[PDB]
From a paper:
The [name].3 channel is a voltage-activated potassium (Kv) channel that is abundantly expressed on T cells where it plays an essential role in cell activation. Potassium (K+) ions leave the cell through [name].3 which makes the cell membrane more negative (repolarized), and thereby sustains the large driving force for calcium entry that is needed for T cell activation and proliferation. When [name] channels experience sustained activation they undergo C-type inactivation, a process that diminishes ion permeation and is thought to involve a conformational change in the selectivity filter that disrupts ion coordination. Here, we report structures of human [name].3 alone, with a nanobody inhibitor, and with an antibody-toxin fusion blocker.
We then solve the structure of [name].3 with MNT-002 (Minotaur Therapeutics), an engineered antibody where the peptide toxin [name] was fused into the complementary determining region 3 (CDR3) of an IgG antibody. In contrast, the monovalent Fab-[name] can bind only one [name].3 channel, thereby forming a protein complex amenable to single particle cryo-EM structure determination. We then solved the structure of [name].3 with Fab-[name] to a global resolution of 3.39 Å. The Fab binds with an ~45° angle to the extracellular surface of [name].3 and its long and narrow CDR3 ‘stalk’ positions [name] at the mouth of the pore. The Fab portion of Fab-[name] makes no contact with the extracellular loops of [name].3, or any other part of the channel. [name] forms its most significant contact with the pore via Lys22, with the ammonium group hooked downward into the selectivity filter to coordinate the backbone carbonyl of Tyr447 on all four [name].3 subunits (position TVGYG of the K+ channel signature sequence). In this way Lys22 functions as a surrogate K+ ion as proposed. In addition to the contact between Lys22 and the selectivity filter, Ser20 and Arg11 of [name] form hydrogen bonds with His451 of [name].3, but on separate subunits. Despite the absence of the outermost K+ ion in the filter, the key hydrogen bonds formed by Asp449/Trp436 and Y447/T441 are intact, consistent with an active channel conformation. Thus, [name] stabilizes an active conformation of the selectivity filter despite blocking ion flow.
Numbering used by the authors:
A (entry chain D), B (entry chain A), C (entry chain B), D (entry chain C): 103 to 259, 289 to 348, 359 to 491
E (entry chain L): 4 to 216
F (entry chain H): 1 to 103, 108 to 142, 147 to 269
Write the structure that this text describes.
Amino acid sequence: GERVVINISGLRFETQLKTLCQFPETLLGDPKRRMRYFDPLRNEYFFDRNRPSFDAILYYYQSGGRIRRPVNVPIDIFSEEIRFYQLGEEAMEKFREDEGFLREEERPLPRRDFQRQVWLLFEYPESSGPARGIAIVSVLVILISIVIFCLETLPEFSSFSDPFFVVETLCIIWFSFELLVRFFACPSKATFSRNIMNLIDIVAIIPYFITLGTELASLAILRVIRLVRVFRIFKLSRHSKGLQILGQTLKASMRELGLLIFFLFIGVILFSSAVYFAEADDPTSGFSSIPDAFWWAVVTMTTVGYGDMHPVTIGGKIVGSLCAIAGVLTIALPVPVIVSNFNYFYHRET
Amino acid sequence: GERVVINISGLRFETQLKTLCQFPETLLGDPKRRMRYFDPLRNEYFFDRNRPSFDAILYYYQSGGRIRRPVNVPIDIFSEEIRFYQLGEEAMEKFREDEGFLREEERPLPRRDFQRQVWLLFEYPESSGPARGIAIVSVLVILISIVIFCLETLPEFSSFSDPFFVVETLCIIWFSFELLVRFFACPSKATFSRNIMNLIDIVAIIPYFITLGTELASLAILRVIRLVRVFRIFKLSRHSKGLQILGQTLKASMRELGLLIFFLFIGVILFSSAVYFAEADDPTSGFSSIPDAFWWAVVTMTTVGYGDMHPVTIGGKIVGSLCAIAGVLTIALPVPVIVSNFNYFYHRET
Amino acid sequence: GERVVINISGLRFETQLKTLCQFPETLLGDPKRRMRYFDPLRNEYFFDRNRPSFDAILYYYQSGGRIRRPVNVPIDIFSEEIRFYQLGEEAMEKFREDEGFLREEERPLPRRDFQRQVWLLFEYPESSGPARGIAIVSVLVILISIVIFCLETLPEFSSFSDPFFVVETLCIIWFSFELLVRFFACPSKATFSRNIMNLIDIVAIIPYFITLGTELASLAILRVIRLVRVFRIFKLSRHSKGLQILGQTLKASMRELGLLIFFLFIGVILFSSAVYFAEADDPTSGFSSIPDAFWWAVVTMTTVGYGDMHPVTIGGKIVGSLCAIAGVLTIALPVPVIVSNFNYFYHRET
Amino acid sequence: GERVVINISGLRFETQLKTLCQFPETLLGDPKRRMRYFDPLRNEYFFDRNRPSFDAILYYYQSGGRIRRPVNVPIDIFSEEIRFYQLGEEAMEKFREDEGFLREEERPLPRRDFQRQVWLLFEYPESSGPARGIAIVSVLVILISIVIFCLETLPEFSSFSDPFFVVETLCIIWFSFELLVRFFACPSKATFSRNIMNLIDIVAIIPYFITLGTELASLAILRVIRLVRVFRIFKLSRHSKGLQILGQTLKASMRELGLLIFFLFIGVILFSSAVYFAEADDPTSGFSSIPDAFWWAVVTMTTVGYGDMHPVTIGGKIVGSLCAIAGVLTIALPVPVIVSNFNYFYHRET
Amino acid sequence: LNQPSSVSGSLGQKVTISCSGSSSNIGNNYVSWYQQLPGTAPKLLIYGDTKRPSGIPDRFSGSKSGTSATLGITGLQTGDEADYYCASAEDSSSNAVFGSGTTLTVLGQPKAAPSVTLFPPSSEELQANKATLVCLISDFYPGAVTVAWKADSSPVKAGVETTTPSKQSNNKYAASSYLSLTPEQWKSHRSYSCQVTHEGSTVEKTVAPTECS
Amino acid sequence: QVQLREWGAGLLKPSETLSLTCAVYGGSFSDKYWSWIRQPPGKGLEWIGSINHSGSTNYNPSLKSRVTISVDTSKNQFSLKLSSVTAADTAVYYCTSVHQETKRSCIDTIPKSRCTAFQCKHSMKYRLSFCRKTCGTCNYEWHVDVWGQGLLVTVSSASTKGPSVFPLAPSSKSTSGGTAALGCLVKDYFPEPVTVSWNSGALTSGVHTFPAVLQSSGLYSLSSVVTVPSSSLGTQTYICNVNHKPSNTKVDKKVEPKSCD
Ligand SMILES: [K+]
Ligand SMILES: [K+]
Ligand SMILES: [K+]
């Protein structure tokens, strides 16, 4: 248990031999390794290296692997220094996690020589020119599908005299090929369910098939199915990294949307009642019930102010002024949390 | 007058023994307690610890107090050090105080077996199963009461044949049993008239009884009694940590709401006068008095813009443009203080 | 020169004696003063104090006259050390001009038996009881001076029969009275004219007297004097430490209001021209000239949207969408500078 | 393998001599310069200046050139320190590059004393009094050209009888003259056309000349030309350092405007479809097609709310409430990036 | 509301009955029509100018040509012949004015030889010292008879009271005739009879004061 | 089904104010109004007047001063009143339940100059809220639902008497083969009319009742005839049940055949 006087550029740093002996793969825990640096003239190893970063490494030996970065040393020089002392790769990952970066993950691969060949072609698009081509085709089949949905409703517009059935069929044919190839060439049929984008593909392909069946074999129930056709805009989220951050932002902030709608509802039951009672006995617009004023308090608090219903007394007008300012405050109170979450996810890309 | 030399891992700190004997309960203060970590050959008290944190412990002896954290030493590592030096619990408390963290609050319990059982049933909802049941069945009674208060004033809708009176009566009982059972089980009936939420409960009960009294023994006083019915939504404030943080944010930010309404009023008396004089002699909407334009300047400055009254000359229109921009500025000037207060109270939960 | 070695708790500082000589007065300059600390057993002084804050002291001597604070030492402890070494109150001033904390403006209370005892009654209100009385009655007279400018121009309403003339004059009596007490008791006449709050009083007292002069001896003069009367509500800026901060914000941010109005004007000449050309040949509302659309582009960009004039083609509507988003951006670009200036002035009060 | 012992004010640094010789120009490298301070008795080279700033210098030689700045030492003291040491011009500019002030460039100059004379006359108007005159005549000519553009279309308003052609011919004469005298006195005729502000001048000079030429030679191509005349208001961007920051800001953040318009479009196709289906079978305003509701969802989400089309059922109204709140969120999510870019460019002027 | 005197129509014929009013009444598009058999209440024939009230055939049609409202019965059936009224409001909705009527008549019922019934006074009616002579006419179409009395071969004319023709249960008509005579003149002549002629044919029923039962 | 039964004073004096009351069973819970309809014999239909469930009565513009109808939601019943009755006002009165719905409380909220062709056409806040009247986003009805049978109210100063009933049976010459006539004689009665049944409603084969005539003395006259098989002459008990509502009279005269006792 003799004291060892390591010297880093003039700054002496004595520690007990056992404290370093506990870690034997490091530079100072491997005597055949550290011997080179040890100068025996004064019995003190001399390393001419950065001075204010040896304190961290000592704590790692002293506290059984607790590695923390001094906040007056940049990451590059601290990352380089753990390497010279050869604390070891397992140590580096602990440091990497402390910064909080996303340098952990790795994809699997089919590795069968053909399953690997189709999967590379479809899942990853920058890898080869045929692959860049497939994806560009897939943005068009979604854009020529959404154009068909809105046009059908225009007032002017299996007999196949309907071109909004031939064009839908080609679109519900390509989308189905992508779903099937992706399934057969997938490395795992367990993680196929995990991706939400595969579920988006299932939901945007179903209502064409149950419509087909009803004709091939709910009169206003059909309409519930007709709207569920609108979830083909969320097939854009594969070929866009600007939308996947919106996915991760709204999943990590569910509590601060519950708060936004809760705060907004309490006001709509608290300002509406005031204006109904204030404009009670006059030809007061439509304030004929507390339940009626709920439209007026949502339009004034969110600042849209359509102007359909407005107060017409003096008490109504003073309650309208307080309603407008209480809605700029109860809106702007939970939104800084959600804007901050987007900023962390957006820049962490780098 | 002797010079003790401490040696934290190679770094020599030297100090007056008098400064070290100020407190004997501390590891270094008692000669016997600190004697173990002494080295006869070097005449020093060697410790193999953290080099950057002992500067702060030696200030505490030198200043006889004023524990402060070096700002490069992480909170966990510094706390670990105060315990090893056995600084003592009084010092520990002062350290938490400078950061300001609060764990001090403590709530006594009746502990009379019957009282302890009832108070841990109606006060801490997670302590069992029955307390979860009471919490859910109270949230239910609040919610059906609010729907009865709005649908009671739709326009299609003690004889006890009215359904609205019967359903309201059952709720006014549950509300009072919970106030009475809490009152009996309260450990200290001094505190009971001081808590805000206890008061929010009594106010919901009062309107129902005064009516029953009027009807068993106020023309618009009764309409006010119907308005003060509206505070039964605030009974939710116990069953949410979203409303309590809004209560503290609007309590510790009263000055920055006084400023908001004061700034807004000065503008409404300064822009309204301009538009009345500019649109003075023309069939100018309703700008027939400076007092009339006050509705136009509150709707344009808060950005609601209903469109009921608008300016119709060239001077009126130039004053309407300056009014709109001066209201985005005099609104957004005190709101960053109030949004910051919510953020401190919201995250300090952790 | 001779190398003074200064120990500060175990941290040996060394320098040249001629550097200490630069200031003869300081604790390290007068050798009779620093004689107490010297210990000849080790030949070195031992000033037992905080080790990490002696560095800036020695840097002040070496550069001859620069002081800065170490960033990991708090303002209480750096200040305490400056006093112990007596760098002098002029040096303590240098620290102050670096921290920036509000410095003390000289209090020139005047000097005479009653002449000072009156400027204390009116200018400083917190001094006693009757000064509190003058503050409260002056705020009451300002608020019946605004009520009479609004209720006078209501359409329902030196005769002496005229309640409005008599109430207007008691106010002009009191404003003139209070101003003359304070122009006589002022410590300096030249400074009085410079202060803005003396100019506010003069221009609020002018128009009642020059109307009396013209009335007792004007085609647009009479038109505009009734508008410059609206500046009696800036007399309230003396009894309110939340308007003086708004005055200092708007003075320290004139450049970022020039930018706001300049950015807003460029858009109004760039979006208006587009909508006039797009809705050129149709019964297109009032878009009969590029000069006409200027009202539509100020109401859509500031988000008021009255709804008086709206686009009615497809090109007009696409230009209306781009106009709305380009106005949320060109408004929100210079406002963070002005909100930040208010925050510095607001909190620097402490 | 010789250990030298530099001692900066007491804090001893020890290094091998090969490290010092790595850079010859440095004070330590050259033997002649270093020998001046060496003190033979202690064998150490004493210097007497800031101690906390020598670590970055010694880490410079160690790293072979990578120079940093420690986070506690301010910029002035660190810059003055590199100078006393004598490192090199590339080292100083490497510090300026690691810091982030971009002072590297200059401007070529004709060096002919006529080309030099008039290029100094025109381009750098803080030269002389006449250059200030030419800048002010240039600002006034741009302004009367915009005034001429908008007045032309007012309903009431080459035979020389028409005033508007004559005043517009004089402004085109002065624009063309300024552009040609700048182009011939420009020290490169090759870096000219790559610029932007000269391209703006060409674009605002072209359509009058093609009007003239074809006047002396399905919907008028003249009409599209008559739209590109509006870019004469971008020639204020030479005489205004608040439009050039908006140019660099809107360039450096194109991605966060693509995101803003993309997020806004996805909502307009997702809320519009809901309201069309909800208000499907009733005299529901104009919601006669999903393509029709696109105006309603752009006006409600951006908060303009003109009030021309509003929902009239219960499902329409609940979709209108969710539309209003989802537009305050999808607007405020990418705007903090663009406001931050303006702040960096705006203050970096200093 | 003015309507002409009479309209005569057959089985299977189309008659457009006019309601000529004004635009305070027919310009309401909420007119009323009725149908009145004598001896019954009026029954709602039409409402709303086209709408059909319950119990009314779709064949009746309220075609309107301006202020002269029409009634179109396609194929006039048997049970329709009655008094037909116009009705509406006037310048208000809680208000009303009717018409005075027109008679609609249907020809085409079953004709037959009349089943006439004669009742001689009762013995208690001779004790009550009065003599009414019952001469009833039933099962006869068209509804036209003249009412005669027959002493042994000589006419009796005075004291006659007869009723106009009225309808019976099984799609035919019914009538009656009363000869008011003193009992001293009833018990003075040996035989009394009721001559009734339907379409020229006279069916006789004879009674005497002296025939028991 | 709304069942309407009329009850009141039916035989009144000159210059005495009228009173009927219609018993209304089957009250539908809708917006439908009750009134009365009068009709003299040979004279056309005429409305008298209504009352609604709110309280506003409406009458014929020719006849506002001579009606008073009252409501009662406790008995669910409607009434009638006529003043100054004379010989022209001899009528039978049918109580009636009528369906009467109406159509105008619009105002231009904003000054008229602002309301224009462009705005009404393109802006809904202008069209259905700010300018309803100048744009045009703001006519009658009368048709009955439930008729009544009628009650005869006739003005007179004379007195009312009951009927005299007599057995009328066929003889040995009046027989018409296998089917013979049989009936009753209602003579010297006032007023019109009186019904004569058979077997309390069990004999309807060949039932023939006749309308009554007027006399110069003030009484009315009718008789009956039913066609029965002549073998049953003397077998069944034939009872023509005269019921007189203004006199409360029921004379159960059983009809027996002829004999010479
Ligand atoms: K807004
Ligand atoms: K708005
Ligand atoms: K609006």
